[PDB]
Amino acid sequence: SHMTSATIPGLDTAPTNHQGLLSWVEEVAELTQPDRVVFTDGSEEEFQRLCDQLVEAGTFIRLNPEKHKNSYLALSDPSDVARVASRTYICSAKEIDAGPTNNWMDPGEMRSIMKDLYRGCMRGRTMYVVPFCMGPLGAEDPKLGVEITDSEYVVVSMRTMTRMGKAALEKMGDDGFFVKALHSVGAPLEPGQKDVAWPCSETKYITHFPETREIWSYGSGYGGNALLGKKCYSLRIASAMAHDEGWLAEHMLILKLISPENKAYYFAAAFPSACGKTNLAMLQPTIPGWRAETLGDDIAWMRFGKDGRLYAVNPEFGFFGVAPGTNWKSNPNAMRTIAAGNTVFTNVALTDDGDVWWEGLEGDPQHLIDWKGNDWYFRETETNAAHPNSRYCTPMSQCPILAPEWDDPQGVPISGILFGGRRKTTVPLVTEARDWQHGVFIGATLGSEQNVRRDPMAMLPFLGYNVGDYFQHWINLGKHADESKLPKVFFVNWFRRGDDGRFLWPGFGENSRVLKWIVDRIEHKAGGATTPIGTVPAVEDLDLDGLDVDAADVAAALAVDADEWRQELPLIEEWLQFVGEKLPTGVKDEFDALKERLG
Ligand SMILES: Nc1nc2c(ncn2[C@@H]2O[C@H](COP(=O)(O)OP(=O)(O)O)[C@@H](O)[C@H]2O)c(=O)[nH]1
């Protein structure tokens, strides 16, 4: 019963304008043996058809439309609840081209393993061919992809997370390049066999071939493992492209800040997961005359324009956010984005009237059905109602403070790049780099307590190539650029704590005051202290008007203590040794310079 190429249903009616794509699909279909092949078009009628089928399969339940229109809740197999690092590989030809932040395997060996897994993996399933565009369609030469998947769940979320379907397919023309992205949940079915709501496999791989720009995923239907745009393309493959083609693919939010004189500024900020970020991208300023709009909260792609400035575009089309922690008081604009519906919730809790709830959200519901389908009772049940890593998947276009430039293929000019992590000591609230190479060093040595892990540019699990070569790439772009047009680089810390354990700086909206200092520095309208680590404002350099806070706590937040920084040195030094032979001299230079300035 193994079926050949042109007898698999849906293959005879396949679009044929792009022969490379069609040959690839046929080769894949021959291998995985699905019941049928469907090319998705991203239309609303298709979206509803797939959602209905998801409801019928039990994968989705339809949420009360009075509270979220066109919205769904999906509960995963508990063994498949997140992105898995140790199962993620960069399979460059040479191990050194993956380097010490990456998991490597010989690509010939990986292909032998995965090709074996893929054989007959789609039996009894529909194989979807999902064309998609990264970034606005308006671009002349955008980065395109096609995800083949046996997961309908994946198709629906890809429609939200990328520009999916007919348009992207047309953009590929007859011979356009695209990233081949292959995915299976690894759960073949016999004829007539009852599926489960969330199929998956104990055997999981998430593999990237940087040279050919390919992504092979198997065994997981969840998140970044399966939505191949989200990190696999946006960061892993894209960063390798950017390396070769002279640009930057980064783990950054893009923020639009507008001053009281009505001038707009655009900032990119690299914070690791949970150092957010989502909150900064959706800032509501607490000082009069300042407004903020968002272009994105996770990925930024940046290229130098004609005028020598650095321009950023958000390559994604949707938000894929962590639900718990999100609430109306901390992040009302995120909540309003969600409130407009068209959202897929994964692993949150269900209320009695078909709303959704997760830990930290308002309401105090008395009874819930939790993320595993069990009864949950307020102030009694000892387990979390929602999975701690549960998700919302929501269109970007519903964000009430979406910047009008959000879908512009030309991008936005970046004035400032920010780096930050969770540091309870040592790092001050905000610091400005001395120049580009010092900013690269700051990015390169970014620490976050999540005992301090180094997470360079928030890219630790996401680099598509050797971390040292990546630092060198950052260095090279600044050396060959007009220094006057380069974004200024800043180093922030929202999480410094006093001895009594409280946050020295209140943060959230109040971070607008830090952003105001940053803008003034770019305009040369503010001063600061020259310290061994960079330019750090004193309390009197910050607008603290109307902020109910002890000025002493602010001074403490801004302090540069040499003893603390001397303890930081060997930690940094050991990280630079870990970076290995490809550590750029330029980075080591900045280490020595900082050490010398410290005395
Ligand atoms: N103390 C403090 N915590 C914050 C601040 N901004 C975000 N956090 C908290 O850090 C967590 C993660 O924030 P989030 O923006 O969702 O992070 P992301 O994953 O980088 O997008 C949430 O629990 C926030 O309440 C801040 O400015 N100050």
| Pairing label, strands 488-492, 412-420 | parallel
Q: Cα–chain-centroid distance for residue 550?
A: 36
For residue 244, give Cα distances in angstroms to 15, 117, 210, 299.
32, 31, 11, 19
- Is residue 297 within 8 A of residue 445, CB to CB? The reply is no
114: its two tokens = 């995965």
**Which residues are catalytic, by number?**
275
Residue range(s) occupied by CATH 3.40.449.10 in the chain? 7-58+84-246
Please state, in angstroms and rounded to a whole number, the distance separating the CA atoms of residues 172 and 131.
Answer: 9
Please state, in angstroms and rounded to a whole number, the distance separating the CA atoms of residues 173 and 116.
Answer: 32
427: its two tokens = 């790092």
Report the binding-site residues for Mn(2+).
231, 251, 298
Q: What's the gap in Å between 277 CA and the centre of ligand 1?
A: 7
Reduced to 3 states (helix: H, G, I; strand: E, B; else coil), residue 206 is: strand
Please state, in angstroms and rounded to a whole number, the distance separating the CA atoms of residues 88 and 12.
Answer: 35
Please state, in angstroms and rounded to a whole number, the distance separating the CA atoms of residues 402 and 400.
Answer: 6
Give the sign of the dihedral formed by CA 169, CA 175, CA 176, CA 182.
positive
Please state, in angstroms and rounded to a whole number, the distance separating the CA atoms of residues 500 and 554.
Answer: 15
The one-letter amino acid code at 205 reads Y
Please state, in angstroms and rounded to a whole number, the distance separating the CA atoms of residues 448 and 490.
Answer: 16
Read off φ and ψ for residue 409, nearest 5 degrees: -70, -15
Tell me the structure's resolution in angstroms, rounded to a single decimal.
2.3
Q: Does domain 59-83+317-400 have CATH number 1.10.3720.10?
A: no
Name residue, tokens 């030469």.
141
Q: Is the CB of 273 under 6 A from ligand 1?
A: yes
Residue range(s) occupied by CATH 2.170.8.10 in the chain? 59-83+317-400
Residue range(s) occupied by CATH 3.90.228.20 in the chain? 247-316+401-599
For residue 359, give Cα distances in angstroms to 80, 330, 370, 384.
20, 13, 11, 7
Please state, in angstroms and rounded to a whole number, the distance separating the CA atoms of residues 481 and 308.
Answer: 7
Residue-wise DSSP of 351-376: ETTS-EE-TT-SS--SEEE-TTS-EE
Please state, in angstroms and rounded to a whole number, the distance separating the CA atoms of residues 50 and 497.
Answer: 49
The one-letter amino acid code at 127 reads M
Q: What's the gap in Å between 275 CA and the centre of ligand 1?
A: 5
89: its two tokens = 């590989």
DSSP 3: P
Report the binding-site residues for GTP.
274-279, 391, 422, 508-511
Q: What's the gap in Å between 280 CA and the centre of ligand 1?
A: 8
Please state, in angstroms and rounded to a whole number, the distance separating the CA atoms of residues 145 and 153.
Answer: 18
Read off φ and ψ for residue 77, nearest 5 degrees: -60, 130
Closest-CA residue to 458 (of 237, 272, 301): 272
Please state, in angstroms and rounded to a whole number, the distance separating the CA atoms of residues 284 and 207.
Answer: 39
Report the binding-site residues.
83, 222-224, 231, 251, 273-279, 298, 389-391, 422, 508-511
193: its two tokens = 């066999």
159: its two tokens = 């429609």
Q: Is the CB of 277 under 6 A from ligand 1?
A: yes
Please state, in angstroms and rounded to a whole number, the distance separating the CA atoms of residues 537 and 531.
Answer: 10
Please state, in angstroms and rounded to a whole number, the distance separating the CA atoms of residues 593 and 599.
Answer: 10
238: its two tokens = 């894209």
Please state, in angstroms and rounded to a whole number, the distance separating the CA atoms of residues 575 and 552.
Answer: 33
236: Cβ–Cβ under 8 A, 6 or more apart, which residues? 90, 208, 210, 215, 462, 463, 464
**Cβ neighbours around 598 below 10 Å, total:** 16
Q: Is the CB of 511 under 6 A from ligand 1?
A: yes
- Is residue 292 within 8 A of residue 401, CB to CB? The reply is yes
Q: Is the CB of 24 under 6 A from ligand 1?
A: no
Which is the closest atom of ligand 1 to the Cα of 507?
27
Environment class of 364 (CB within 10 Å of its CB; exposed 0-12, middle 13-18, buried 19+): exposed
| Residue of 253, 254, 275 with the most ligand 1 atoms within 8 Å of its CB, for mutation | 275
With vertex at residue 289, the alpha carbon angle to CA 285 and CA 292, rounded to the nearest 5 degrees, is 40
Experimental method: X-ray
Q: How many Å is the maximal CA-CA distance in the chain?
A: 78
74: its two tokens = 């999906």
| Residue of 275, 279, 316, 327 with the most ligand 1 atoms within 8 Å of its CB, for mutation | 279
Name residue, tokens 């092979």.
216
Q: How many CA atoms lie within 13 A of 511 on its CB side?
A: 22
Please state, in angstroms and rounded to a whole number, the distance separating the CA atoms of residues 133 and 28.
Answer: 21
Which residue puts its alpha carbon closest to atom 18 of ligand 1?
276
Please state, in angstroms and rounded to a whole number, the distance separating the CA atoms of residues 51 and 88.
Answer: 29
Q: What's the gap in Å between 419 CA and the centre of ligand 1?
A: 14
Give the fold, CATH level 3, of 247-316+401-599.
Phosphoenolpyruvate Carboxykinase; domain 3 (3.90.228)
Closest-CA residue to 183 (of 140, 216, 136): 216
Q: Output the CATH code of domain 7-58+84-246.
A: 3.40.449.10
β-pair partners for 74: 346
Reduced to 3 states (helix: H, G, I; strand: E, B; else coil), residue 268 is: strand
336: Cβ–Cβ under 8 A, 6 or more apart, which residues? 399, 400
- Is residue 489 within 8 A of residue 521, CB to CB? The reply is no
Please state, in angstroms and rounded to a whole number, the distance separating the CA atoms of residues 168 and 152.
Answer: 19
Which residue puts its alpha carbon closest to atom 5 of ligand 1?
508
| Pairing label, strands 430-432, 488-492 | antiparallel
DSSP 407: G
328 phi-psi bin (left φ>0, alpha ψ -120 to 50, beta other): alpha
Q: What's the gap in Å between 131 CA and the centre of ligand 1?
A: 34
